[PDB]
Amino acid sequence: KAAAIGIDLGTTYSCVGVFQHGKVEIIANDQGNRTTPSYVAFTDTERLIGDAAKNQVALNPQNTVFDAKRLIGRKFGDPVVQSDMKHWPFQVINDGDKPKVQVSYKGETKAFYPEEISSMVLTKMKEIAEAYLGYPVTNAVITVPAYFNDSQRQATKDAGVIAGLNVLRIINEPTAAAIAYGLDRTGKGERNVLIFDLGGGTFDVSILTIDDGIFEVKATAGDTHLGGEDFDNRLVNHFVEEFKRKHKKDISQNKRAVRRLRTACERAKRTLSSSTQASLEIDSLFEGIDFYTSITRARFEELCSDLFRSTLEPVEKALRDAKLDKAQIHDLVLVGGSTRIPKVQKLLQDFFNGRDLNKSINPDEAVAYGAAVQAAILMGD
Numbered sequence: 001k002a003a004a005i006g007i008d009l010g011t012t013y014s015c016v017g018v019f020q021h022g023k024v025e026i027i028a029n030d031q032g033n034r035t036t037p038s039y040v041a042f043t044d045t046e047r048l049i050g051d052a053a054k055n056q057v058a059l060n061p062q063n064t065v066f067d068a069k070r071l072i073g074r075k076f077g078d079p080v081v082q083s084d085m086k087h088w089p090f091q092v093i094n095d096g097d098k099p100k101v102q103v104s105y106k107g108e109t110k111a112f113y114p115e116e117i118s119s120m121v122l123t124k125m126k127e128i129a130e131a132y133l134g135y136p137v138t139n140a141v142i143t144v145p146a147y148f149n150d151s152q153r154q155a156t157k158d159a160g161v162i163a164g165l166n167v168l169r170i171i172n173e174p175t176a177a178a179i180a181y182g183l184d185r186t187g188k189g190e191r192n193v194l195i196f197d198l199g200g201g202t203f204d205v206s207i208l209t210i211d212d213g214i215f216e217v218k219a220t221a222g223d224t225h226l227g228g229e230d231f232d233n234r235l236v237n238h239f240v241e242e243f244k245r246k247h248k249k250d251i252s253q254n255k256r257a258v259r260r261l262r263t264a265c266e267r268a269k270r271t272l273s274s275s276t277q278a279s280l281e282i283d284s285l286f287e288g289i290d291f292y293t294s295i296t297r298a299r300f301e302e303l304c305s306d307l308f309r310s311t312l313e314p315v316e317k318a319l320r321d322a323k324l325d326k327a328q329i330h331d332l333v334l335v336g337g338s339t340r341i342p343k344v345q346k347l348l349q350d351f352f353n354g355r356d357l358n359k360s361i362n363p364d365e366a367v368a369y370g371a372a373v374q375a376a377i378l379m380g381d
C-alpha cells in the first residue's frame with residue numbers, strides 16, 4: 001500500500017522524493033526546505049538533526065557532526081580519513097581500525113560509528129517523508145557515488161536499516177540522475193550520458209553508457225578543490241577583505257565572526273543564481289560592528305571565474321578516458337546546487353558547442369528524484 005522513498009544521502013545535504021499520484025514529488029521538510037543538511041548535533045539535552053543541527057553549529061562546533069559520508073565504510077588508518085581529520089572540529093577516534101566520532105552528549109562522552117551518524121540523517125529524511133505522506137515508510141532506495149566500494153555501500157545500507165528502512169537497492173548517484181530524466185527507457189543501442197555534479201561536497205563528472213536500460217560507468221573524474229565550500233571560501237575572503245578596508249579590522253582570526261560570515265555567504269551564493277544581487281545583513285559581526293552589504297552576480301561569477309572555468313578540465317579528462325568526442329555525448333545532465341549558476345551553464349553549454357542541457361529538474365533534487373522513480377519500479381507502483 002505504502003510508497004517507497006528515494007533518498008539522496010549527500011555529503012553536505014540530503015534530499016528525499018516519492019512517487020505517488022502518478023508523479024515524483026520531492027518532499028520539503030518542516031522548515032519548508034527541499035534539501036536537508038546532513039548534520040547531527042549533540043547537546044546537554046538533545047540530539048538535533050538537519051536544519052536544527054546546522055543552525056547551531058557555531059555554538060557547538062565540537063559536538064556538531066557533519067561529513068560522516070567521508071568516513072563511512074572506511075578504516076581508521078585510511079589515508080583519506082587520517083587527512084580529513086585535521087580539518088574537522090569534532091573528534092574522531094580509533095575503534096578496531098574503524099573510526100568513530102566522539103562527542104559530549106547529555107553530559108557524557110559518547111562515540112558513534114559513521115553509519116550510526118548517517119542513520120540519524122536517514123531517520124530525519126524518513127520522518128520528513130512520513131510527515132508528508134501521513135503514513136509509515138518502510139522501504140527506500142538510497143544513492144551513493146559511483147566510486148564507492150563494497151564496504152562504503154554496505155555501511156550506507158546499514159545506516160538505512162538502522163533507520164528502520166528496508167533498503168531495496170543502493171544505486172549510483174549519476175545513474176539516479178539519468179533515471180530522473182528517463183534516459184534509460186529507450187531500447188537497444190548505446191546512449192552516452194554525461195552527469196555534471198557541482199555544488200556539493202565535491203565536484204563529480206560521470207560518463208555512463210546506457211544500452212536497453214543497462215548502465216555502465218565509462219569514466220569518472222572530478223576535482224576535490226571545487227566543492228561548494230571552495231566557492232563559499234571565495235565569498236568569505238571577499239567580505240573579510242571588504243570589512244577590513246572599511247573598519248581597518250581583520251576578522252579572520254575570530255572564529256565566530258568567520259562562521260557567521262560563512263553562513264551568510266552560502267545563503268548569498270544561492271540567491272545569486274536567481275538574482276543579479278544578494279544582500280548580507282549580519283548584526284554585530286565583529287566587536288559589535290554590524291555588516292550589511294551585498295554582492296552582484298558577476299562580481300561573484302567573476303570572483304569565482306577561475307573555479308567555474310576549472311570545472312571543464314575534469315569534463316575533458318572524462319571524455320578522454322571514455323574515449324568519446326564531445327559530439328558523441330547524447331545527453332548532458334545537471335546535478336548539484338551550483339549548476340543553476342548561469343555562468344556554469346554557459347561554460348558547459350559552450351564547451352559542448354551549444355548543446356542544450358537536461359535541467360528541468362532542480363539539480364540538487366535530481367538524484368533523489370531518480371532514486372524515487374527506481375524505488376517505485378522495484379515496489380511495482
Ligand SMILES: [Zn+2]
Nearest residue numbers: 223224225226
Ligand atoms: Zn584539484
